[PDB]
Paper text:
Phosphoserine aminotransferase (PSAT) is a pyridoxal 5′-phosphate-dependent enzyme involved in the second step of the phosphorylated pathway of serine biosynthesis. PSAT catalyzes the transamination of 3-phosphohydroxypyruvate to 3-phosphoserine using L-glutamate as the amino donor. The pyridoxal-5′-phosphate (PLP)-dependent transamination reaction catalyzed by PSAT, which necessitates a lysine residue in the active site, has two reversible half-reactions. In yeast S. cerevisiae, the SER1 gene encodes PSAT and yeast cells supported by fermentable carbon sources, mainly by the glycolytic pathway, to synthesize serine and glycine.
Therefore, to elucidate the structural features of fungal PSAT, we determined the crystal structure of Saccharomyces cerevisiae PSAT (ScPSAT) at a resolution of 2.8 Å. Furthermore, the large domain exhibited a Rossmann fold that contained central seven-stranded β-sheets (β1–7 with strand topology 3-2-4-5-6-7-1) surrounded by twelve α-helices at the periphery of the domain. The small domain folded into antiparallel β-strands, β8 and β9, flanked by four α-helices, α12, α13, α14, and α15. Moreover, the halide-binding site and gate-keeping loop were located between the large and small domains. Due to the lack of PLP bound in ScPSAT, the N-terminal region might be not stabilized in the structure.
Numbering used by the authors:
A (entry chain B): 51 to 267, 277 to 394
B (entry chain A): 54 to 217, 221 to 267, 272 to 395
């Protein structure tokens, strides 16, 4: 019982979570993440100050977008600061430069700004925390590090709340991690009645009222994973290896630029999710089966955007990536 | 992928008008999602919002109402049984005194709780005023009775059963009508009407659209079914639990008044026998002398402060007979 306490200890270790933030887990792993973070962080604003302000969404891909549209559905005050789709013809793939939107943010008050660090379906990963949000002290950052939580050294002090579960519209199944500021929780409490109620701020169900979740306290499963990443260098190690894994993969595709298309702009190329397509779309299944033959599986793009997507994880070996690099390079010179 | 649904459908004769589905959470999760979902269902059929109405017979239906209020679902208590005996639960007012508050108002739904566990208050019957009113969708919580109380599923718009955090499972049998109508809301009419919106993870028409569901126990589910199916179904289980309770109450009722049974006979619960000692001094010896006969799990609820006798499906009549004997031995012993 309460191996929770140990896993939490592991997390505050590998991430160096400061005393200013608290770790809590939530049954949900997906959609549950959006709704609960929007309603709770709206209420945290109403606590700290006395009024409501809109929430800011940086839409860099599918998950970003869904997150915003759910804050819209719930009638949480929120606005799309930008939609990367609008800056390269309705398709994701770029992350507009700060200057083109940073002033939509500076000086204005926000309940929080949301972003999705790694956009799994489209292979858009933020190169950096936008510096315009970092320098503003009255903008709380909500980040979804769903893909990179244990593979990208981040500074937990800069974040209002960190979310990591999956990036799948699964049910209530799975778990979402949370690392939230204690400032925020105190302020979620310090607000009710007319304040939240005449302002129209939607009330979060108590099942998901963040302060009540920490007060109410099959999960050894992750405490195990936390332990293997520990010792083996921690997050910084796993980052450096995932980075290396991707460098090799991308070079193979860039090299045979005659044969493949990498549709995501290099600046925001995801290291966990590599997305590419064949210029001759009549050889996809030939590609899929030859790869099947080589025990290199899990490459068909999600059945929406199509094409191909090679996912990199902490458990993957550099030599297993190099096996795929070998096939990619061989298939292009073959055709 | 086990359709434990099929055995529930057989267990309760669930008609084709209704759909079984499950949700993770028990406890509060059911309060929250049923109120905003069913409020939306009203904006489906009609253009407007009507208040939800709550029949507060004990602590659980009280807490449902209080959460709907917190959430800003339009909702009102039709009665509160506490008012009809000195602010103490234990009674259900004659429907004469509230019939017309039902029949002459517009309600999204009317909520009642079949069995209030903490106070041992159970509805003798589904209220005839609710059933005759064609404009009232009944939302019933049979959380301690779903398998020991024969009911007519067609009389209900929502039957929900769990227990009384995010843990456990809440079971749902819902009119297909209601589902079509929560899908048939506009989302914009709901913003204007001020109706709070349920997070899509708990949006009933999507929860039924596909799923995932934390399982492994879902096997235990049809396990508990099927047995009951082959014991003679819910009717047999009901007759049995009735027997266990009738011999228990006879032991309390037939004393020279050594014990108090606070629940009115009209509305005494078959699953939770609440009782108390006329001379409170002896309540500590009561529990020791009971452990001396291997009878445990008998102390109040930390709030009410008397003694509870929670009858369930497993509890043998022999076991309640032993308890009957210890009640009858202790009252004579300590005359």
């Amino acid at each position: 019982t309460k191996v929770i306490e140990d896993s939490k200890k592991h997390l505050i270790e590998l991430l160096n979570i400061p005393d200013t933030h608290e770790v809590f887990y939530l049954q949900g792993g997906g959609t549950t993440g959006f709704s609960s973070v929007a309603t709770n962080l709206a209420a945290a604003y109403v606590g700290k100050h006395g009024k409501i302000a809109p929430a800011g969404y940086l839409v860099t891909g599918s998950w970003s977008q869904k997150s915003f549209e759910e804050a819209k559905r719930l009638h949480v005050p929120a606005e799309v600061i930008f939609n990367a789709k609008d800056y390269n013809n309705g398709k994701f793939g770029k992350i507009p430069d700060e200057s083109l939107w940073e002033d939509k943010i500076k000086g204005k008050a926000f309940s929080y700004v949301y972003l999705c660090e790694n956009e799994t379906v489209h292979g858009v990963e933020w190169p950096e925390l936008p510096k315009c949000l970092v320098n503003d002290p009255n903008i709380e950052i909500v980040a979804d590090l769903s893909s990179d939580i244990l593979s990208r050294k981040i500074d937990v002090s800069q974040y209002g709340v960190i979310m990591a579960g999956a990036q799948k519209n699964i049910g209530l199944a799975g778990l979402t991690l949370y690392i939230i500021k204690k400032s925020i929780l105190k302020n979620i409490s310090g607000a009710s009645d007319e304040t939240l109620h005449e302002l129209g701020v939607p009330i979060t169900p108590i099942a998901f009222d963040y302060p009540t979740v920490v007060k109410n306290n099959t999960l050894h499963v992750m405490d195990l994973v936390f332990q293997h990443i520990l010792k083996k260098g921690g997050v910084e190690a796993q980052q450096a290896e995932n980075e290396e894994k991707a460098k090799i993969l991308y070079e193979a595709l860039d090299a045979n630029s005659d044969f493949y298309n990498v549709p995501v702009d290099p600046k925001c190329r995801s290291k966990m999710n590599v997305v590419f397509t064949l210029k001759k779309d009549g050889l996809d299944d030939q590609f899929l089966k030859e790869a099947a033959a080589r025990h290199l599986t899990g490459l068909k793009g999600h059945r929406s955007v199509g094409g191909f997507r090679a996912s990199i994880y902490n458990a993957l070996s550099v030599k297993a990536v190099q096996n795929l690099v070998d096939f990619i390079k061989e298939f292009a010179e073959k055709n």
